[PDB]
Amino acid sequence: TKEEAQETRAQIIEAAERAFYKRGVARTTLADIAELAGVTRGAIYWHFNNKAELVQALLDSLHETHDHLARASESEDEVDPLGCMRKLLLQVFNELVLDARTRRINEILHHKCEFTDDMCEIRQQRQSAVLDCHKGITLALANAVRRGQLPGELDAERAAVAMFAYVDGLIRRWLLLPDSVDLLGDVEKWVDTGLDMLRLSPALRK
Amino acid sequence: KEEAQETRAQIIEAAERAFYKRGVARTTLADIAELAGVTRGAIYWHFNNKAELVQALLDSLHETHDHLARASESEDEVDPLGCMRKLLLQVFNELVLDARTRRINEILHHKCEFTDDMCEIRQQRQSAVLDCHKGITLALANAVRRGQLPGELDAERAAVAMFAYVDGLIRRWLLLPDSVDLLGDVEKWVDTGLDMLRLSPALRK
Ligand SMILES: O=c1c(O)c(-c2ccc(O)c(O)c2)oc2cc(O)cc(O)c12
Ligand SMILES: O=c1c(O)c(-c2ccc(O)c(O)c2)oc2cc(O)cc(O)c12
């Protein structure tokens, strides 16, 4: 039963990471993920309708580790939301450098996953996630404005974009040129540089 | 002319269409040649492989901006920061206004995988970004050797932070266009980033 279904789902997802990583999403089909996993073909199709659905499963496995700190950062009851957002970003960067799984998935998302008309769902998916992530940072930022943590007149919306843009470019930079930027030693300076932009930038106000 | 000089240009325009439609990984020279109306032999004449075409698209982005870029990185110039702000203004303008620039960037960012089959693509991108970094740092060095940026700021970590902000903003606009108002609020976006290189203590040491 159940136990055995939910072990081969883990086996499928794990061969998917390895296969998308070696060969990229474009030219890896479910047929090939099946063989690496050792499962059958019908195993995969019961589990995952198609490739876009599997890509979304990997992208979802990234949320688990950061869950708690993000919903706390976002609740208007919490009294130190910018410190919750700070500590999230520290955990996001640490996990990236320490957890090879997390780094591998991010490198698939960033450097091995094309947007083509062939599978529009991958693009669509991604637009949702960045919108989701946008919705959260905004609420959290608004919370920091009320709590007088960041300038009281701040554009929460444009600040959320600046910040997402900075964190995303930084992750991508290090995925590309790791031995350049020591993300694990200065990790505090990287998170803080971005956060400074939100409290000091006049361009982000009004 | 002779035979065509601008067969090269016609192959490049077909490469952008092929790559934009179906992405770099599953585009062959045969697709590109069929699309260009020439033979594969005519392609190998200008290019040894696909990675070279990808390189040519990349290199074509530096043409419009190279003047404000060269002006920013020299000592002679009076206004180094104002040249980075102008360059970045032109970068964001060309992107929103030119479809070709927008398509080349959407190819680079969202339509080109880094794989073992073609490791020259990841390599060419590393060098391109390292090249860009040497530049940003030189531009940031003379600005601090002036009234423009705080004294003894780590030129290099601010170079990374800025390249990262801009690169992430561009990619974000390509993903969700009608969410950044990239054109019109242009001034604010460029400045949000440049405010970062002064105002931020974390960028100091
Ligand atoms: O939660 C966040 C998050 O996940 C990311 C992010 C960006 C790219 C990735 O590849 C990734 O794994 C994470 O940026 C953020 C930036 C913020 O200011 C606040 C956040 O809460 C997140
Ligand atoms: O010249 C620059 C440039 O080109 C880009 C850039 C980044 C990502 C792209 O995808 C792109 O097309 C351009 O960022 C910059 C950031 C700076 O601080 C200074 C610059 O001079 C540039």
Domains of chain B by residue range: 1-205
CATH architecture label of B1-205: Orthogonal Bundle (1.10)
**Helix/strand/coil (H/E/C) assignment for every residue in chain A:** CHHHHHHHHHHHHHHHHHHHHHHCCCCCCHHHHHHHHCCCHHHHHHHCCCHHHHHHHHHHHCCHHHHHHHHHHHCCCCCCHHHHHHHHHHHHHHHHHHCHHHHHHHHHHHHCCCCCHHHHHHHHHHHHHHHHHHHHHHHHHHHHHHCCCCCCCECHHHHHHHHHHHHHHHHHHHHHCCCCCCCCCCHHHHHHHHHHHHHHCHHHEC
State the resolution, in angstroms. Answer: 2.4
Nearest to A162 among B114, B192, B202 (CB): B192
**Which residue among A60, A61, A84, A89 has the greatest number of ligand 1 atoms within 8 angstroms of its CB, and so is best to mutate?**
A89
**Under DSSP, is residue B163 helix (H, G, I), strand (E, B) or coil?**
helix
Distance from CA of B36 to the nearest CA of A (A): 21
Contacts of A1 (CB under 8 A, 6+ apart): none
Q: Which of ligand 1's atoms lies nearest the C-alpha of A136? A: 21
- For residue B159, CA distances in Å to A106, A171, B167, B180 come to 23, 15, 12, 23
Q: Which of these, B140, B145, B136, B139, lies nearest to B164 by C-alpha position?
A: B136
* Beta carbons of B192 and A201 less than 8 angstroms apart: yes
**Under DSSP, is residue B135 helix (H, G, I), strand (E, B) or coil?**
helix
Domain topology for A1-206: Tetracycline Repressor; domain 2 (1.10.357)
Can you tell me which residue has the tokens 């990841």? B122
> Does B167 sit in the ligand 2 pocket, CB within 6 Å?
yes
Q: Which of B24, B160, B187 to mutate to test the interface with A (most CBs of A within 10 A)?
A: B160
What residues in B contact A172, CB-CB < 8 Å?
164, 167-168, 171
Method in brief? X-ray
